[PDB]
């Protein structure tokens, strides 16, 4: 299962 | 921006036997950017309802896709894959050869 | 055996043609198991292997929300990257992310990965330590400082050492019939006259899984790497892969040539020859 990406570049 | 032209192979899922249902594949790989147009041709004419894989990419970031359709090879019918990409000044046609 | 899990993600902007298209796929080893395409009508993450279908509605809800969130982050990041590289708003650009883990035969973490690319080139990667970053240029250094300040690496480490490994172990068990089965290549040698003086011998490997394979030709026991045409391994469309290797041989010398095949699924490595 996936993880959430939380921070933008 | 650096661009990479597609590699192209056209081939069948199983060894060709005339009169026996099979799948015709065109595998395009090693390309950037991702936009690409691919047709499968039977005697020069576009085959309808060709399906393709979902866009993915290799370790070096370059893209690959498989286009495919069910077909029944015969002695006389000629098949090919036509590919357009920004790296190409004109579309590339690769003929199906049952021995490759 | 050792195994891997990967999630691949691509957004492609299309100014004047709506929001970017977003496509992500997940693999265990060389098996696709999930997919999401933002241009599908009411898009959901969908199964693409039988062994993932048993996951319940809560799994598909969470996956789908993660995918929609990633598409949204990508849209913001594509805007940001235009600024970081002093680019106009007119062109199409690409943002790619891969992450995942490798485990050994014991199921223990071997290596974790998380890396991003802009316009087909490295941008920022998590190093193998799962604690530090490699930024490709001065733009990605801005991102690195932002992600260091926010302790992103620590979050990735926790996922990659924990859930990534645990869920991969689950998938390998649930999918043991296929994921833990190596299918050996079906092999044969064909003969293709060029002239009365020479012919091509083509050694075929068909129907194999996983994709890793070695095909070589020898002449009197010496390798022929320089004179071998070896095509890229290619998908058959039924989970399996294909490859061939060809050499041009003088007429009458065919029995000097042997093809050697190594693959995980074979009882033993093969040595084959042309059989008229």
């Amino acid at each position: 299962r996936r993880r959430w990406r939380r921070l933008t570049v | 921006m650096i661009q990479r032209t597609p590699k192209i192979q056209v081939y069948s899922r199983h060894p060709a036997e005339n009169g026996k249902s099979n799948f015709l594949n065109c595998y395009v790989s090693g390309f950037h950017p991702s936009d690409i147009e691919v047709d499968l041709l039977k005697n020069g004419e576009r085959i309808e309802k060709v399906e393709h894989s979902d866009l993915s990419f290799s370790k070096d970031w370059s893209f690959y896709l498989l286009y495919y359709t069910e077909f029944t090879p015969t002695e006389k019918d000629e098949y090919a894959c036509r590919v357009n990409h920004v790296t190409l000044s004109q579309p590339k046609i690769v003929k199906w050869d049952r021995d490759m | 055996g050792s195994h891997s899990m990967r999630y691949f993600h691509t957004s492609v902007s299309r100014p004047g043609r709506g929001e970017p298209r977003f496509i992500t796929v997940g693999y265990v080893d060389d098996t696709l198991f999930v997919r999401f395409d933002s241009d599908a009508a009411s898009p959901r993450e969908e199964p693409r292997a039988p062994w993932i279908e048993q996951e319940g509605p809560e799994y598909w809800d969470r996956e789908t929300q993660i995918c929609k969130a990633k598409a949204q982050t990508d849209r913001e990041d594509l805007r940001t990257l235009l600024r970081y590289y002093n680019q106009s708003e007119a062109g199409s650009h690409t943002l790619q992310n891969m992450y995942g883990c490798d485990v050994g035969p014991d199921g223990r973490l071997l290596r974790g990965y998380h890396q991003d690319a802009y316009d087909g080139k490295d941008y920022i990667a998590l190093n193998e330590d799962l604690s530090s970053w490699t930024a490709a240029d001065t733009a990605a250094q801005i991102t690195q400082r932002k992600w260091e300040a926010a302790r992103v690496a620590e979050q990735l480490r926790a996922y990659l050492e924990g859930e990534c490994v645990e869920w991969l172990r689950r998938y390998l068990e649930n999918g043991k019939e296929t994921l833990q089965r190596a299918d050996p290549p079906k092999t044969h040698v064909t003969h293709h006259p060029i002239s009365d003086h020479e012919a091509t011998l083509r050694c075929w490997a068909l129907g194999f899984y996983p994709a890793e394979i070695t095909l070589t030709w020898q002449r009197d026991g010496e390798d022929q790497t320089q004179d071998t045409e070896l095509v890229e391994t290619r998908p058959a469309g039924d989970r399996t892969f294909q490859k061939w290797a060809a050499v041009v041989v003088p007429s009458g010398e065919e029995q000097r040539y042997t093809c050697h095949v190594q693959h995980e699924g074979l009882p033993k490595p093969l040595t084959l020859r042309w059989e008229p």
Side-chain angles (χ1 to χ4, degrees), chain C residues 141-195:
Chain C
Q141 291 170 16
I142 303 302
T143 298
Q144 175 176 345
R145 293 157 204 173
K146 179 173 177 182
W147 289 6
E148 285 169 340
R151 289 207 187 266
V152 172
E154 284 88 344
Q155 297 295 304
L156 280 163
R157 175 179 170 190
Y159 169 76
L160 293 165
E161 290 195 295
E163 283 195 19
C164 187
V165 164
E166 287 316 301
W167 285 83
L168 174 52
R169 283 176 62 66
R170 175 203 189 96
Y171 301 150
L172 287 166
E173 175 61 20
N174 293 347
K176 72 190 166 194
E177 168 188 298
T178 49
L179 298 175
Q180 300 187 60
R181 188 187 76 236
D183 298 319
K186 304 181 185 94
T187 57
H188 72 300
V189 173
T190 54
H191 184 290
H192 309 282
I194 300 161
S195 71

Short mmCIF file of all heavy atoms in Angstrom, two decimals, chain C residues 141-195:
data_model
loop_
_atom_site.label_atom_id
_atom_site.label_comp_id
_atom_site.label_asym_id
_atom_site.label_seq_id
_atom_site.Cartn_x
_atom_site.Cartn_y
_atom_site.Cartn_z
N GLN C 141 18.21 21.94 -4.60
CA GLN C 141 18.73 22.34 -3.28
C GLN C 141 17.73 23.16 -2.49
O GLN C 141 17.72 23.09 -1.25
CB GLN C 141 20.03 23.12 -3.44
CG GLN C 141 21.20 22.32 -3.92
CD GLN C 141 22.38 23.21 -4.29
OE1 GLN C 141 22.41 24.38 -3.91
NE2 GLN C 141 23.32 22.67 -5.04
N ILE C 142 16.90 23.98 -3.13
CA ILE C 142 15.82 24.69 -2.45
C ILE C 142 14.82 23.69 -1.84
O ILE C 142 14.43 23.80 -0.71
CB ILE C 142 15.10 25.66 -3.42
CG1 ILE C 142 16.07 26.67 -4.05
CG2 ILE C 142 13.95 26.38 -2.70
CD1 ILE C 142 16.80 27.53 -3.06
N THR C 143 14.43 22.70 -2.64
CA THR C 143 13.59 21.62 -2.15
C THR C 143 14.26 20.86 -0.99
O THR C 143 13.61 20.59 0.03
CB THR C 143 13.24 20.67 -3.28
OG1 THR C 143 12.48 21.39 -4.29
CG2 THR C 143 12.37 19.54 -2.79
N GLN C 144 15.55 20.58 -1.15
CA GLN C 144 16.26 19.84 -0.10
C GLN C 144 16.21 20.59 1.23
O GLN C 144 15.93 20.00 2.25
CB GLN C 144 17.71 19.60 -0.53
CG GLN C 144 18.58 18.92 0.56
CD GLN C 144 19.98 18.60 0.08
OE1 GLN C 144 20.30 18.60 -1.09
NE2 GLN C 144 20.85 18.30 1.04
N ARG C 145 16.45 21.91 1.20
CA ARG C 145 16.41 22.69 2.42
C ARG C 145 15.00 22.64 3.03
O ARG C 145 14.84 22.53 4.24
CB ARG C 145 16.84 24.15 2.19
CG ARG C 145 18.31 24.41 1.82
CD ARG C 145 18.50 25.79 1.05
NE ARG C 145 19.71 25.82 0.21
CZ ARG C 145 20.02 26.79 -0.64
NH1 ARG C 145 19.23 27.85 -0.79
NH2 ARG C 145 21.16 26.72 -1.32
N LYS C 146 13.96 22.73 2.17
CA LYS C 146 12.58 22.68 2.64
C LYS C 146 12.27 21.34 3.29
O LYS C 146 11.66 21.27 4.36
CB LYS C 146 11.60 22.98 1.46
CG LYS C 146 10.10 22.95 1.77
CD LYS C 146 9.27 23.43 0.54
CE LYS C 146 7.77 23.35 0.75
NZ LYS C 146 7.10 23.78 -0.50
N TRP C 147 12.73 20.26 2.68
CA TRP C 147 12.43 18.92 3.14
C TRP C 147 13.28 18.52 4.37
O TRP C 147 12.81 17.74 5.22
CB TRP C 147 12.63 17.93 2.02
CG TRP C 147 11.56 18.04 0.95
CD1 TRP C 147 10.56 18.98 0.86
CD2 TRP C 147 11.34 17.14 -0.11
NE1 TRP C 147 9.76 18.73 -0.23
CE2 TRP C 147 10.23 17.61 -0.85
CE3 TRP C 147 12.01 16.00 -0.56
CZ2 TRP C 147 9.74 16.95 -1.97
CZ3 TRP C 147 11.53 15.36 -1.70
CH2 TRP C 147 10.42 15.84 -2.39
N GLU C 148 14.48 19.05 4.46
CA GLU C 148 15.31 18.92 5.69
C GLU C 148 14.63 19.63 6.86
O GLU C 148 14.47 19.03 7.94
CB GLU C 148 16.73 19.44 5.46
CG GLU C 148 17.60 18.51 4.63
CD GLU C 148 18.90 19.10 4.16
OE1 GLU C 148 19.06 20.36 4.13
OE2 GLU C 148 19.75 18.30 3.75
N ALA C 149 14.15 20.86 6.65
CA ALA C 149 13.48 21.62 7.70
C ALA C 149 12.24 20.90 8.23
O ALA C 149 11.94 20.95 9.41
CB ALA C 149 13.09 22.99 7.22
N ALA C 150 11.53 20.22 7.33
CA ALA C 150 10.32 19.48 7.66
C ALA C 150 10.54 18.00 8.05
O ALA C 150 9.58 17.30 8.30
CB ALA C 150 9.37 19.53 6.50
N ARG C 151 11.79 17.55 8.08
CA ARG C 151 12.13 16.16 8.46
C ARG C 151 11.35 15.11 7.62
O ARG C 151 10.86 14.10 8.11
CB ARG C 151 11.98 15.97 9.99
CG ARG C 151 13.09 16.70 10.79
CD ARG C 151 13.37 16.02 12.14
NE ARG C 151 14.29 16.75 13.03
CZ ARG C 151 15.60 16.54 13.09
NH1 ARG C 151 16.20 15.62 12.34
NH2 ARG C 151 16.32 17.24 13.96
N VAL C 152 11.26 15.39 6.32
CA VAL C 152 10.62 14.46 5.38
C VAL C 152 11.31 13.09 5.38
O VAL C 152 10.64 12.05 5.28
CB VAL C 152 10.60 15.08 3.94
CG1 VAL C 152 10.13 14.05 2.91
CG2 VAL C 152 9.71 16.28 3.87
N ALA C 153 12.63 13.07 5.40
CA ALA C 153 13.37 11.82 5.27
C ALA C 153 12.99 10.86 6.37
O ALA C 153 12.89 9.66 6.16
CB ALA C 153 14.86 12.04 5.24
N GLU C 154 12.79 11.40 7.58
CA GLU C 154 12.42 10.58 8.72
C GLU C 154 11.07 9.89 8.51
O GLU C 154 10.89 8.72 8.86
CB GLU C 154 12.43 11.42 10.02
CG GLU C 154 13.86 11.71 10.55
CD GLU C 154 14.52 12.98 9.98
OE1 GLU C 154 14.09 13.55 8.94
OE2 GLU C 154 15.52 13.41 10.59
N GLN C 155 10.15 10.60 7.87
CA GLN C 155 8.85 10.02 7.52
C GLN C 155 8.98 8.91 6.48
O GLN C 155 8.32 7.87 6.58
CB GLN C 155 7.92 11.11 7.01
CG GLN C 155 7.62 12.15 8.07
CD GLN C 155 6.86 11.53 9.21
OE1 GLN C 155 5.79 10.94 9.00
NE2 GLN C 155 7.41 11.62 10.42
N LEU C 156 9.82 9.14 5.48
CA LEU C 156 10.04 8.15 4.44
C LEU C 156 10.70 6.91 5.01
O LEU C 156 10.32 5.80 4.68
CB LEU C 156 10.87 8.73 3.27
CG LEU C 156 10.01 9.56 2.32
CD1 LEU C 156 10.90 10.40 1.47
CD2 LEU C 156 9.10 8.66 1.50
N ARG C 157 11.71 7.09 5.85
CA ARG C 157 12.38 5.97 6.48
C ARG C 157 11.37 5.10 7.22
O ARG C 157 11.40 3.88 7.10
CB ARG C 157 13.45 6.46 7.44
CG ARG C 157 14.10 5.31 8.21
CD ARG C 157 15.17 5.75 9.16
NE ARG C 157 15.54 4.63 10.01
CZ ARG C 157 16.32 4.74 11.08
NH1 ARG C 157 16.87 5.90 11.37
NH2 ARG C 157 16.57 3.67 11.80
N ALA C 158 10.46 5.74 7.94
CA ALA C 158 9.50 4.97 8.75
C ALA C 158 8.57 4.15 7.84
O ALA C 158 8.29 2.99 8.12
CB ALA C 158 8.70 5.86 9.64
N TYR C 159 8.13 4.76 6.73
CA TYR C 159 7.32 4.03 5.79
C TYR C 159 8.10 2.90 5.13
O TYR C 159 7.62 1.76 5.02
CB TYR C 159 6.76 4.97 4.69
CG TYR C 159 6.13 4.23 3.53
CD1 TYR C 159 4.88 3.66 3.64
CD2 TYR C 159 6.83 4.03 2.37
CE1 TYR C 159 4.33 2.97 2.55
CE2 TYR C 159 6.31 3.32 1.31
CZ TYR C 159 5.05 2.81 1.41
OH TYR C 159 4.57 2.12 0.34
N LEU C 160 9.30 3.20 4.63
CA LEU C 160 10.04 2.24 3.83
C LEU C 160 10.49 1.01 4.66
O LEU C 160 10.46 -0.12 4.18
CB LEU C 160 11.24 2.89 3.17
CG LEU C 160 10.85 3.94 2.11
CD1 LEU C 160 12.06 4.82 1.76
CD2 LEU C 160 10.17 3.30 0.83
N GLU C 161 10.89 1.25 5.91
CA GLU C 161 11.28 0.16 6.82
C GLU C 161 10.12 -0.62 7.41
O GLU C 161 10.30 -1.75 7.88
CB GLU C 161 12.16 0.69 7.98
CG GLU C 161 13.53 1.13 7.52
CD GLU C 161 14.48 1.28 8.70
OE1 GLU C 161 14.18 2.17 9.49
OE2 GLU C 161 15.47 0.52 8.80
N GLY C 162 8.93 -0.01 7.43
CA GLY C 162 7.77 -0.57 8.09
C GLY C 162 6.72 -1.04 7.11
O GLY C 162 6.82 -2.14 6.60
N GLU C 163 5.76 -0.17 6.79
CA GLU C 163 4.64 -0.53 5.90
C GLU C 163 5.08 -1.08 4.58
O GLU C 163 4.48 -2.01 4.07
CB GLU C 163 3.72 0.67 5.70
CG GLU C 163 2.84 0.89 6.92
CD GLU C 163 1.66 1.82 6.68
OE1 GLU C 163 1.30 2.04 5.52
OE2 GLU C 163 1.08 2.30 7.68
N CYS C 164 6.11 -0.50 3.98
CA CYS C 164 6.48 -0.96 2.61
C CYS C 164 6.86 -2.46 2.68
O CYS C 164 6.41 -3.27 1.92
CB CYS C 164 7.60 -0.11 2.06
SG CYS C 164 8.00 -0.45 0.30
N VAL C 165 7.66 -2.82 3.69
CA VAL C 165 8.10 -4.19 3.83
C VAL C 165 6.95 -5.10 4.23
O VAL C 165 6.84 -6.21 3.74
CB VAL C 165 9.29 -4.24 4.85
CG1 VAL C 165 9.56 -5.64 5.35
CG2 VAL C 165 10.50 -3.62 4.18
N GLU C 166 6.13 -4.63 5.16
CA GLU C 166 5.04 -5.42 5.72
C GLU C 166 3.97 -5.71 4.67
O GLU C 166 3.48 -6.84 4.55
CB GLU C 166 4.51 -4.82 7.02
CG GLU C 166 5.47 -5.00 8.21
CD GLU C 166 6.09 -6.40 8.34
OE1 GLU C 166 5.36 -7.41 8.47
OE2 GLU C 166 7.34 -6.51 8.31
N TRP C 167 3.62 -4.68 3.91
CA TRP C 167 2.65 -4.87 2.86
C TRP C 167 3.19 -5.70 1.70
O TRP C 167 2.46 -6.54 1.14
CB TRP C 167 2.03 -3.54 2.40
CG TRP C 167 1.04 -3.01 3.40
CD1 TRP C 167 1.32 -2.28 4.53
CD2 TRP C 167 -0.38 -3.27 3.44
NE1 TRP C 167 0.16 -2.03 5.23
CE2 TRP C 167 -0.89 -2.62 4.58
CE3 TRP C 167 -1.27 -3.94 2.59
CZ2 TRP C 167 -2.25 -2.65 4.92
CZ3 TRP C 167 -2.62 -3.97 2.93
CH2 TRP C 167 -3.10 -3.32 4.07
N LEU C 168 4.44 -5.53 1.33
CA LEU C 168 5.04 -6.41 0.31
C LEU C 168 4.98 -7.87 0.75
O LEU C 168 4.63 -8.74 -0.06
CB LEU C 168 6.47 -5.98 0.04
CG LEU C 168 7.32 -6.84 -0.88
CD1 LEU C 168 6.59 -7.12 -2.23
CD2 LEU C 168 8.67 -6.19 -1.15
N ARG C 169 5.29 -8.14 2.01
CA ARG C 169 5.24 -9.52 2.57
C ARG C 169 3.82 -10.08 2.45
O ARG C 169 3.61 -11.23 2.06
CB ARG C 169 5.76 -9.56 4.03
CG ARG C 169 7.29 -9.47 4.06
CD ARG C 169 8.04 -9.40 5.46
NE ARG C 169 7.88 -10.52 6.39
CZ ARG C 169 8.33 -11.77 6.20
NH1 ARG C 169 8.92 -12.14 5.08
NH2 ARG C 169 8.13 -12.68 7.15
N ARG C 170 2.83 -9.25 2.77
CA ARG C 170 1.43 -9.62 2.63
C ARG C 170 1.08 -9.98 1.17
O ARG C 170 0.47 -11.02 0.91
CB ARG C 170 0.55 -8.48 3.14
CG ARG C 170 -0.96 -8.63 2.96
CD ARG C 170 -1.68 -7.29 2.96
NE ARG C 170 -3.14 -7.39 3.00
CZ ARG C 170 -3.89 -7.32 4.10
NH1 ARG C 170 -3.35 -7.17 5.31
NH2 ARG C 170 -5.22 -7.41 3.99
N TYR C 171 1.46 -9.12 0.24
CA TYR C 171 1.17 -9.35 -1.18
C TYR C 171 1.84 -10.62 -1.68
O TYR C 171 1.23 -11.39 -2.43
CB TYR C 171 1.60 -8.14 -2.03
CG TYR C 171 0.93 -6.82 -1.67
CD1 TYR C 171 1.60 -5.63 -1.86
CD2 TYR C 171 -0.33 -6.76 -1.13
CE1 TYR C 171 1.05 -4.42 -1.54
CE2 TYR C 171 -0.90 -5.56 -0.79
CZ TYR C 171 -0.21 -4.38 -1.00
OH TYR C 171 -0.81 -3.18 -0.65
N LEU C 172 3.08 -10.89 -1.24
CA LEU C 172 3.80 -12.07 -1.71
C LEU C 172 3.11 -13.34 -1.22
O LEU C 172 3.07 -14.34 -1.94
CB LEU C 172 5.23 -12.04 -1.19
CG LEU C 172 6.12 -11.01 -1.88
CD1 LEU C 172 7.45 -10.79 -1.09
CD2 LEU C 172 6.45 -11.40 -3.32
N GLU C 173 2.57 -13.31 -0.01
CA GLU C 173 1.80 -14.45 0.50
C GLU C 173 0.48 -14.61 -0.26
O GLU C 173 0.14 -15.71 -0.73
CB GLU C 173 1.56 -14.32 2.01
CG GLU C 173 0.66 -15.41 2.59
CD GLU C 173 1.18 -16.83 2.44
OE1 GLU C 173 2.38 -17.04 2.23
OE2 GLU C 173 0.35 -17.76 2.59
N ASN C 174 -0.29 -13.54 -0.35
CA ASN C 174 -1.59 -13.61 -1.01
C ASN C 174 -1.45 -13.97 -2.48
O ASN C 174 -2.29 -14.69 -3.01
CB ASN C 174 -2.37 -12.31 -0.83
CG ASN C 174 -2.77 -12.09 0.61
OD1 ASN C 174 -2.68 -12.99 1.42
ND2 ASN C 174 -3.24 -10.89 0.91
N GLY C 175 -0.38 -13.51 -3.10
CA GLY C 175 -0.09 -13.82 -4.51
C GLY C 175 0.93 -14.92 -4.72
O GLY C 175 1.50 -15.00 -5.80
N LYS C 176 1.10 -15.81 -3.73
CA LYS C 176 2.20 -16.78 -3.80
C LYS C 176 2.14 -17.70 -5.04
O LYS C 176 3.16 -18.12 -5.56
CB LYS C 176 2.31 -17.59 -2.50
CG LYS C 176 1.25 -18.61 -2.23
CD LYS C 176 1.37 -19.16 -0.78
CE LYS C 176 0.14 -19.95 -0.32
NZ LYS C 176 0.16 -20.17 1.16
N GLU C 177 0.94 -17.97 -5.56
CA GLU C 177 0.81 -18.83 -6.73
C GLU C 177 1.54 -18.31 -7.96
O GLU C 177 1.98 -19.10 -8.76
CB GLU C 177 -0.69 -18.97 -7.08
CG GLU C 177 -1.02 -19.58 -8.42
CD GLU C 177 -2.52 -19.47 -8.74
OE1 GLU C 177 -3.35 -20.05 -7.98
OE2 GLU C 177 -2.84 -18.81 -9.78
N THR C 178 1.61 -16.98 -8.11
CA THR C 178 2.22 -16.33 -9.25
C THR C 178 3.50 -15.57 -8.90
O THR C 178 4.51 -15.68 -9.59
CB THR C 178 1.25 -15.35 -9.90
OG1 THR C 178 0.65 -14.49 -8.92
CG2 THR C 178 0.11 -16.10 -10.56
N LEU C 179 3.43 -14.76 -7.84
CA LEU C 179 4.58 -13.93 -7.49
C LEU C 179 5.79 -14.79 -7.06
O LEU C 179 6.91 -14.37 -7.27
CB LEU C 179 4.23 -12.96 -6.37
CG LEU C 179 3.13 -11.93 -6.70
CD1 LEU C 179 2.79 -11.11 -5.50
CD2 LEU C 179 3.55 -11.04 -7.85
N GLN C 180 5.51 -15.94 -6.46
CA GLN C 180 6.57 -16.87 -6.03
C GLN C 180 6.73 -18.08 -6.95
O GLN C 180 7.25 -19.13 -6.53
CB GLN C 180 6.35 -17.27 -4.59
CG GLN C 180 6.36 -16.08 -3.64
CD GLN C 180 6.31 -16.46 -2.19
OE1 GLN C 180 7.21 -17.17 -1.71
NE2 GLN C 180 5.29 -16.00 -1.48
N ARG C 181 6.37 -17.92 -8.22
CA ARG C 181 6.59 -18.91 -9.26
C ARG C 181 7.39 -18.31 -10.40
O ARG C 181 7.00 -17.32 -11.01
CB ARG C 181 5.27 -19.42 -9.82
CG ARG C 181 5.43 -20.59 -10.76
CD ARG C 181 4.16 -21.00 -11.44
NE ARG C 181 3.74 -20.11 -12.53
CZ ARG C 181 2.58 -19.49 -12.64
NH1 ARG C 181 1.69 -19.51 -11.66
NH2 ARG C 181 2.30 -18.82 -13.76
N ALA C 182 8.53 -18.92 -10.69
CA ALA C 182 9.30 -18.54 -11.85
C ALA C 182 8.96 -19.47 -12.99
O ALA C 182 8.97 -20.67 -12.84
CB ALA C 182 10.82 -18.63 -11.53
N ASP C 183 8.59 -18.90 -14.15
CA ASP C 183 8.28 -19.67 -15.32
C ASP C 183 9.52 -19.67 -16.19
O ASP C 183 9.99 -18.61 -16.61
CB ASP C 183 7.13 -19.06 -16.08
CG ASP C 183 5.87 -19.04 -15.28
OD1 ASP C 183 5.59 -20.04 -14.58
OD2 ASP C 183 5.09 -18.07 -15.31
N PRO C 184 10.06 -20.85 -16.48
CA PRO C 184 11.24 -20.94 -17.32
C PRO C 184 10.94 -20.55 -18.77
O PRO C 184 9.79 -20.70 -19.22
CB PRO C 184 11.62 -22.40 -17.25
CG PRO C 184 10.37 -23.08 -17.00
CD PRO C 184 9.58 -22.19 -16.07
N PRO C 185 11.94 -20.10 -19.50
CA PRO C 185 11.76 -19.86 -20.94
C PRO C 185 11.55 -21.19 -21.70
O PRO C 185 12.17 -22.23 -21.37
CB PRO C 185 13.10 -19.22 -21.37
CG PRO C 185 14.10 -19.73 -20.35
CD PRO C 185 13.33 -19.85 -19.09
N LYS C 186 10.62 -21.16 -22.64
CA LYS C 186 10.57 -22.11 -23.75
C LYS C 186 11.59 -21.66 -24.77
O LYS C 186 11.58 -20.49 -25.20
CB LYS C 186 9.17 -22.15 -24.34
CG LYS C 186 8.05 -22.48 -23.34
CD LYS C 186 6.69 -22.54 -23.99
CE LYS C 186 5.56 -22.76 -22.98
NZ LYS C 186 5.00 -21.47 -22.54
N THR C 187 12.48 -22.56 -25.18
CA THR C 187 13.60 -22.17 -26.05
C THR C 187 13.63 -23.00 -27.31
O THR C 187 13.24 -24.16 -27.33
CB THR C 187 14.92 -22.30 -25.30
OG1 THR C 187 15.08 -23.65 -24.82
CG2 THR C 187 14.94 -21.43 -24.08
N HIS C 188 14.08 -22.37 -28.40
CA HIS C 188 14.35 -23.04 -29.67
C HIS C 188 15.27 -22.18 -30.52
O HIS C 188 15.45 -20.98 -30.25
CB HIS C 188 13.03 -23.42 -30.39
CG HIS C 188 12.27 -22.27 -30.97
ND1 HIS C 188 11.78 -21.21 -30.23
CD2 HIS C 188 11.85 -22.05 -32.25
CE1 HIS C 188 11.15 -20.37 -31.03
NE2 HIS C 188 11.20 -20.84 -32.27
N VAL C 189 15.87 -22.80 -31.52
CA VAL C 189 16.80 -22.12 -32.40
C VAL C 189 16.24 -22.23 -33.80
O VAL C 189 15.88 -23.32 -34.25
CB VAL C 189 18.21 -22.76 -32.40
CG1 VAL C 189 19.08 -22.13 -33.45
CG2 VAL C 189 18.88 -22.59 -31.05
N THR C 190 16.16 -21.09 -34.48
CA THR C 190 15.79 -21.05 -35.88
C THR C 190 16.90 -20.59 -36.78
O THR C 190 17.89 -19.98 -36.34
CB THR C 190 14.60 -20.11 -36.08
OG1 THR C 190 14.89 -18.80 -35.52
CG2 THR C 190 13.38 -20.63 -35.29
N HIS C 191 16.72 -20.90 -38.06
CA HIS C 191 17.74 -20.76 -39.08
C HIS C 191 17.18 -19.96 -40.27
O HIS C 191 16.12 -20.30 -40.78
CB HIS C 191 18.18 -22.18 -39.51
CG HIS C 191 19.30 -22.22 -40.50
ND1 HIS C 191 19.18 -21.82 -41.81
CD2 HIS C 191 20.57 -22.68 -40.37
CE1 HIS C 191 20.33 -21.99 -42.44
NE2 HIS C 191 21.18 -22.54 -41.59
N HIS C 192 17.84 -18.86 -40.62
CA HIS C 192 17.32 -17.88 -41.58
C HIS C 192 18.39 -17.58 -42.62
O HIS C 192 19.25 -16.70 -42.43
CB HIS C 192 16.89 -16.61 -40.84
CG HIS C 192 15.99 -16.88 -39.69
ND1 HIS C 192 14.65 -17.16 -39.84
CD2 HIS C 192 16.25 -16.98 -38.36
CE1 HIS C 192 14.12 -17.40 -38.66
NE2 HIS C 192 15.07 -17.31 -37.74
N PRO C 193 18.37 -18.31 -43.73
CA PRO C 193 19.32 -18.04 -44.83
C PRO C 193 19.41 -16.57 -45.23
O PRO C 193 18.39 -15.90 -45.40
CB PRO C 193 18.76 -18.90 -45.97
CG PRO C 193 18.15 -20.07 -45.25
CD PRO C 193 17.53 -19.48 -44.01
N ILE C 194 20.63 -16.07 -45.37
CA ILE C 194 20.90 -14.75 -45.93
C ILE C 194 21.27 -14.84 -47.39
O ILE C 194 20.84 -14.01 -48.21
CB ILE C 194 22.00 -14.02 -45.09
CG1 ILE C 194 21.54 -13.85 -43.63
CG2 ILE C 194 22.34 -12.67 -45.68
CD1 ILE C 194 22.68 -13.57 -42.66
N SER C 195 22.05 -15.88 -47.70
CA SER C 195 22.62 -16.12 -49.03
C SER C 195 23.05 -17.59 -49.06
O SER C 195 22.85 -18.32 -48.09
CB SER C 195 23.81 -15.19 -49.23
OG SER C 195 24.92 -15.56 -48.41
#
